[PDB]
Ligand binder design. Structure first.
Ligand SMILES: NC(=O)c1ccc[n+]([C@@H]2O[C@H](COP(=O)([O-])OP(=O)(O)OC[C@H]3O[C@@H](n4cnc5c(N)ncnc54)[C@H](O)[C@@H]3O)[C@@H](O)[C@H]2O)c1
Ligand SMILES: NC(=O)c1ccc[n+]([C@@H]2O[C@H](COP(=O)([O-])OP(=O)(O)OC[C@H]3O[C@@H](n4cnc5c(N)ncnc54)[C@H](O)[C@@H]3O)[C@@H](O)[C@H]2O)c1
Lengths: 329, 329
């Protein structure tokens, strides 16, 4: 009989679901509770996880025929990887499908803070056109951008802000060579503190690890300029959200723009919603039609590979492959 | 010691200091023609802050006038003929905020593509799941249509092509095609072609009799239903009544406006009740850098004419021989 696939959340483009349905039977859940996942996972061979939905260890353990878990994008913080590896279940992500889209969105957010764009749009529409008399937009030319995490997106962001705006770009990333920054005109710094002291804009593009977990706390905001801005499009847990709220109240920084949150989705009464110079979007930086199509096709094709016994291109737990063999033959 | 009247203050105080160092100055705030009239009779130079008016009857009262300086490019509110008839040199101060307006244009283009202020409002109201209902636009490989390829249009075209990966078309009857070539754009003779091909149309023309209300309903009918209009040039270039109708009939998707006709916009402007509309209160050229270069340049030209040296931005160089007759020889 045809294998079953569980979609914990739809894909961002249904070209991926169409591909899955060529050879599997799928069931789609919509923001399901842990029990709904436990009911629907028992006989599936493949699972797709739309961020920020979570797949805990207890759910993976009930799935006796599971072969592969696919995430919606790069991040895997909603998968229990240890549990999958213990069971011989292959975990794949879909990286670098939204690189252009997030760099565009980050540039848009950097520019919107500098020009107070949403605040000013709200002022004109309410009748306070004459707020212009006390407004002083920032000219981005020759200001300094600090990139934390110089990977696919961070490097593109450094490239664009150079070409588009004439900004000086500094980067902090211990795991990449200095030459990677020079190629796009940036300077790789060994000391994050230097980047924090020199930057007028600080943009986050790291992977979420135990080192980047809550990297940006009150200690780090104290080191940034009072005039400076934070932008986070990477992961919510990189920023202590409670510390960010204190930092804004105490004028440690001037504002921020966030596409990611912790917890995500954010609560209805999040105190960040009442702050001057705060710009939010609901994890849409990497969700353009182009990026959604590419990541959907990628996730669907990888799920099909593992069902066939074929090694996929984006295994994140390759040490689990032999135990997968053990169970798949 | 010579007098200088400032009909309106300068954009940066450094310019008033440069004048004060050799002249005696008086400053007026939005003065009536009569207020100017009994303040101008003994002065040698006059500065006009846009959009203040310097009428011919006022100039005729000023017996010792040598120079008039506007705050920016615009001299339309100055009676050039009366100045020439009297041997008064009129100077403007052009191209002082080119980079600032280019930046503001990039901000508005991007904010429209990413639905930035609308998404900000949605998260702040707890409507994070609006993400399931929409997708931002990826600028890469979209077509940008530049109307008016001058200082700002040339910069905007270059960055959107080089840094954003957009195809750029341009319409401007009064520059050669090679000017677009150089920055990766294509100058088209037929505006209709640019309208049909563009996903974003940005206006950067001078306000002339030809461009007054150039963008009416017959123009919006030719744009794409999915396209956006950006206007950071002059408000009279757009018939706002037709823009309102165009949004209501979904002839275009939305618009970003820094300028208005009438200006200031009224409290009951229909444009506010549209979601894909982004407004700013005529601030695109306002940056500390731009204000400082304009004020310094304005002061420096006034000081040259009082000394007898030709300033670099003479609007009416035909008045020079009579100026010589009056104050030198
Ligand atoms: N819509 C969205 O907001 C969404 C879209 C896709 C990417 N994501 C997120 O953006 C982030 C980056 O994406 P990417 O594709 O460029 O990943 P990437 O793997 O290409 O780059 C990550 C970079 O972080 C760096 N890094 C790791 N540890 C670090 C540390 N301790 N200090 C500084 N830098 C460190 C890595 O060396 C690496 O260069 C990811 O968290 C990803 O999940 C955002
Ligand atoms: N929003 C602001 O704060 C403010 C700031 C300065 C500039 N202004 C306005 O922005 C606009 C662009 O500034 P600029 O420095 O680039 O002016 P510019 O003189 O450098 O360029 C004007 C261009 O419009 C073109 N043009 C004239 N008639 C045209 C027509 N019928 N069709 C198409 N193009 C035509 C000219 O050939 C010229 O190339 C101006 O209207 C200017 O007054 C905005």
């Amino acid at each position: 009989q045809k294998p079953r696939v569980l979609l914990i959340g739809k894909m961002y483009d249904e070209a991926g679901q169409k591909l899955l349905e060529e050879s599997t039977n799928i069931e789609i859940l919509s923001n399901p509770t842990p029990e709904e996942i436990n009911e629907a996972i028992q006989e599936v061979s493949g699972v797709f996880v739309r961020y920020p939905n979570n797949l805990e260890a207890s759910s993976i353990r009930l799935a006796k025929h599971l072969k592969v878990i696919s995430t919606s994008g790069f991040g895997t913080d909603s998968i229990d990887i240890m549990a999958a590896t213990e069971q011989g279940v292959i975990v794949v992500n879909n990286p670098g499908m939204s690189t252009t889209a997030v760099a565009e969105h980050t540039l848009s957010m950097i520019l919107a803070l500098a020009k107070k764009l949403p605040f000013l749009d709200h002022c004109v529409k309410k009748g306070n056109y004459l707020i212009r008399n006390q407004m002083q937009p920032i000219q981005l030319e020759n200001k300094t951008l600090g990139i934390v995490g110089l990977g696919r997106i961070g490097t593109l962001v450094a490239h664009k802000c150079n070409l588009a705006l004439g900004m000086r770009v500094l980067a902090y990333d211990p795991y990449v060579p200095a030459s990677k920054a020079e190629t796009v005109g940036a300077t790789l710094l060994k000391d994050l503190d230097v980047l924090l002291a020199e930057s007028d804009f600080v943009s986050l593009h790291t992977e979420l690890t135990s080192e980047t977990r809550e990297m940006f706390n009150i200690s780090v905001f104290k080191k940034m300029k009072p005039t400076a801005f934070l932008i986070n499009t990477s992961r919510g847990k990189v920023v202590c959200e409670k510390d960010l709220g204190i930092a804004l109240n105490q004028k440690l920084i001037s504002g921020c723009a966030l596409d990611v949150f912790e917890p995500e989705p954010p609560a209805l009464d999040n105190p960040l919603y009442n702050f001057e110079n705060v710009i939010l979007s609901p994890h849409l930086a990497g969700v353009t039609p182009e990026a959604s199509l590419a990541a959907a096709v990628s996730a669907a094709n990888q799920i099909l590979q593992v069902l066939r016994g074929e090694k996929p291109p984006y295994m994140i737990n390759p040490e689990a492959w032999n135990l997968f063999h053990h169970h798949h033959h």
